[PDB]
Design a protein around this ligand. Structure first.
Ligand code: RX7
Length: 460
């Protein structure tokens, strides 16, 4: 049985509004309804991995797992295996995989983050799962962020607390948060961003939804506008939205949006909004293609409609040469030429680099760079040709060209990272000086840039 070089992944997010689901929820897993939907001819073809995020979930883990497994078995005639399940309050994540993947999946991690202090600690936060699929690391985050049209800044703060404090992936990657730990990271949930239009325009918004004219609404979607101004989800992707707002509906129909202020809403309006989202972030030059992104039309127990997204995701095999793992492959080397970091920091300490990658036996520390002043105020840390030669565990180009090098720039004084980024080894050529670039972030905010040249030697 050959190892796959591609898998498909289902992402579901549903805020269940504290109500049990209806007897049939198959439309969700079939990506049927509104938006970018899945072709009928694929209905019997199982996804490799299903990841289900719920919010306001009133079920026990046992009750929900039974409903999910029964639904997938009805669709596919496959009995899926439970990879992981984790619940914080009424926020839950389930990961199911085809039984043929049981031995391909390892290093399963789960964690949660509670957002807010005192008043604002008690029901919002995130749960997450990570694991290895052969040679590929996968991470999944389900978050229920702060509610209310006038709290987009709070939502952005919730986002930063979740990416800092969610402990998934390889703990040896100590300078790196979840936005750098995975080949593919999917972040979904009731993110609770709203269409920021005046309250008086509610009936106008409903009219536009009835006409399937979403352009004037999406131009006011707080997640799109905050992302465009680099306030949140920096370096994440989202498929184009072509489905109606998924909140806030009257239950038992989809014909009516319930937007007017009520005692039950804390006297807040809920203008129709795209609260329920799926975003992703993959390492550079890895195959990731969104194949569906939409909402169901026929599941009406909640004031939200379920959202689905599906992806093709590139995966690599667990590589074994005569040499690595457990030694170097003296034929392989990675060289950095003329490299420098441009940092936004006002501080003046010395900096060094750490290189982390699963193609190295352990991370590599550089010597300190030489600081200079950029022409527009910046700190430029020059490394020249002083960076160590990296010795990969395997030199075979079918392995090495698929790998990635994580870079952290650290203060000599404090050993704290000022910036993290990632460089693909999927080069246009080997034994050739080629430009490399990554932005640098810390706590998922832009802090600088790393650029220079690379020279990769493989056994070929
Ligand atoms: C968030 C947003 C809105 C318009 S462009 C943009 C940035 N998205 C990218 C990074 C995929 C394009 O380079």
């Amino acid at each position: 049985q050959p190892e796959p070089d591609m898998i498909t992944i289902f992402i579901g997010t549903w805020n269940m509004g504290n109500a049990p689901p209806p007897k049939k929820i198959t439309s969700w897993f079939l990506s049927k309804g509104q938006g970018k939907t899945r072709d009928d001819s694929a209905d019997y073809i199982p996804h490799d991995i299903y990841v289900i995020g719920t919010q306001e979930d009133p079920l026990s883990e046992k009750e929900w797992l039974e409903i999910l497994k029964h639904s997938l078995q009805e669709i596919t005639s496959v009995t899926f295996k439970t990879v992981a399940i984790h619940t914080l309050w009424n926020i839950r994540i389930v990961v199911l995989a085809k039984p043929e993947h049981e031995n391909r999946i390892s290093h399963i991690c789960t964690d949660n983050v509670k957002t807010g202090i005192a008043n604002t600690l008690g029901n919002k936060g995130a749960v997450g799962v990570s694991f290895m699929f052969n040679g590929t690391s996968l991470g999944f985050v389900n978050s229920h962020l702060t509610s209310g049209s006038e709290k987009k800044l709070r939502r952005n703060q919730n986002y930063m607390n979740i990416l800092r404090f969610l402990a998934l992936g390889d703990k040896k990657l100590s300078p790196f948060n979840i936005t750098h730990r995975f080949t593919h990271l999917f972040w979904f949930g009731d993110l609770n961003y709203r269409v920021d239009l005046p309250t008086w325009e509610a009936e106008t918004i409903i009219q536009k939804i009835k006409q399937q004219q979403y352009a004037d609404l999406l131009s006011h979607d707080q997640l799109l506008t905050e992302r465009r101004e680099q306030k949140v989800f920096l370096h994440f992707e989202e498929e184009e939205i072509t489905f109606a707002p998924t909140y806030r509906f009257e239950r038992l129909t989809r014909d009516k949006y319930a937007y007017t202020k009520q005692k039950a809403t804390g006297m807040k309006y809920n203008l129709p909004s795209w609260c329920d989202r799926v975003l992703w972030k993959s390492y550079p030059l890895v195959h990731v293609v969104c194949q569906s992104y939409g909402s169901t039309s026929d599941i009406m127990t909640s004031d939200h409609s379920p959202v689905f997204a599906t992806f093709e995701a590139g995966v690599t095999s667990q590589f074994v040469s005569k040499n690595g793992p457990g030694t170097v492959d003296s034929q392989g080397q990675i060289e950095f030429l003329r490299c420098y970091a441009t940092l936004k920091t006002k501080s003046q300490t010395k900096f060094y680099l750490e290189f982390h990658s699963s193609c190295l036996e352990s991370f590599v520390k550089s010597q300190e760079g030489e600081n200079e002043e950029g022409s527009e105020g910046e700190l430029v840390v020059k490394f020249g040709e002083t960076l160590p030669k990296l010795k990969p565990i395997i030199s075979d180009p079918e392995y090495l060209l698929d790998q990635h090098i994580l870079i952290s720039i650290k203060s000599s004084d404090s050993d704290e990272s000022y910036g993290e980024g990632c460089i693909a080894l999927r080069l246009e050529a080997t034994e050739t000086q080629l430009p490399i670039y990554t932005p640098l972030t810390h706590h998922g905010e832009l802090t600088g840039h790393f650029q220079g040249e690379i020279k990769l030697q493989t056994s070929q």
